[model samples]
Target: VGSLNCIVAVSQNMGIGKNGDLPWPPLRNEFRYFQRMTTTSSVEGKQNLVIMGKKTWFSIPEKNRPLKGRINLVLSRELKEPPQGAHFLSRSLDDALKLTEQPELANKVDMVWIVGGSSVYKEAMNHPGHLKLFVTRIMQDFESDTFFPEIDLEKYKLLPEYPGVLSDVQEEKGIKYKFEVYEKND
Candidate 1:
């Protein structure tokens, strides 16, 4: 898919707890949002594929594993079969491309989305494609062991800056967010 002008659209960002439980918005709510965004929203009827690192896949709630309505593909050094709703593909960026380009698979998909844990995003974005970022600005420091991976601004061209959200929640929680789209230019 590298030379085919394909793209991986990661619809979100947030670490999956190592314990393999739920995170923000809660599991039930989160799955609702996922189904809404990927299937019933602006992209309705489109079967958007999800490519996640093995850890990300494993972290999913067992009941929710291999998300439906979309293809669930996993990347790992082990290269085993993707559980139920998914199909195991490759171990690295190179091998994944090879599988995605296979005539049968390539013909059936819309776009490849890289949903991730830290290492997956780091490796995947090192290639080409656009990265959609929602910058969450915090007014005060909070303690957390995880953070987004380092990204080089020079390698990506910003499509535009929209606006940070302004709301009652923002005022109380001190949450501010700006949407950004970045495409590889180098």
Candidate 2:
């Protein structure tokens, strides 16, 4: 019953990754922005849930395995037990939502964040639940082996502003980007 959203960055070509890593240089501010969005919660005593694929899980260095302060849900059919640092395991996105929607977790959960690997982002885009997108539009293009799904404008509409979100376009290390939020028009 909580908001299910995605937080991602993409190049002008919609490239999300190059061999499992970001194709562009890290924007220090954007990294902090990512931390803040996924960790912030309005409801007292609740924490946000972050879901990612197995490859994404492994991509995170060992020291940061369980991202601090958020519930880590990993999707992997290859494993029976939760990964070493993961808090929950779901075979599919449907199952991931069911875990959050369960009555027992009603008051404990705040929002669900789909932090990606290309396939996870694709699944999140098509999931039946309400979907919101928080994307960092990289102004330049780069070579990539993976990409974000083509968003259907007919389904999701851009908002001029989102509360608590900084909407200004910013630049770092010669890379220009902006934080944009798109919410499903239900």
Candidate 3:
């Protein structure tokens, strides 16, 4: 089975959003990192799958919709079809993941990335699969109404370091943050 990974940025209190959007100001470097992580595929000739909830999908700017270089899958039970730019629409995270295993996509998809809303994050973390979490830990707190679920340490271990991931703390727009990776325990 292909691995399911989550990529997110969370504030000091594990807050991910405020008023339906990002809690912090734009972090160019961080955004660049996200683009790189999701666009690059381990296997040549294949693309990665980026799955996001309905709210998260519309949160992206219209011009940047579809998040070029990868397959964009939006999770939405209400939508009758894929949104304007999204390639696919799924009712749930399981449905989204299963789409990758279908014959048409099995060989074309290299990895599955969950880029989410609070509920989507919660579901992906509890899902059974080879999982990895790519988290940007914001060093400061921001006013937020949506929060990331507390990770279960018993199921996932914070890695000391990961290849292609920066270890040094990063500061952008006066906000400090660090990249972290957590791997699921066997």
Clashes of each: 1, 0, 0
lDDT scores of the candidates, listed in order: 0.51, 0.86, 0.89
Candidate 1's displacement at residue 159, Å, is 3.3
On lDDT, the stronger of 1 and 2 is 2
**Tens digit of lDDT per residue, candidate 2, span 19-79?**
7778997778988988899988866338899999998888777987899999898999998
TM-score, prediction 3: 0.96
Write one digit per residue (lDDT tens) for candidate 1, span 1-186.
222111221213433332443333333333443454443212222355567777777777678677766667788777566655566556776677666657746655555666665677677667655444333333333333344465578776655553332222232223332234455643
Better of 1 and 3 by TM-score: 3
Clashes of 2: 0
Question: If both were scored by TM-score, which would come out higher, candidate 2 or candidate 3?
Answer: 3
RMSD of 3: 1.4
Clash tally for model 1: 1
| Clashing residue pairs, backbone N/CA/C < 3 A, model 3 | none
For model 2, the stretches where C-alpha displacement exceeds 4 angstroms are none
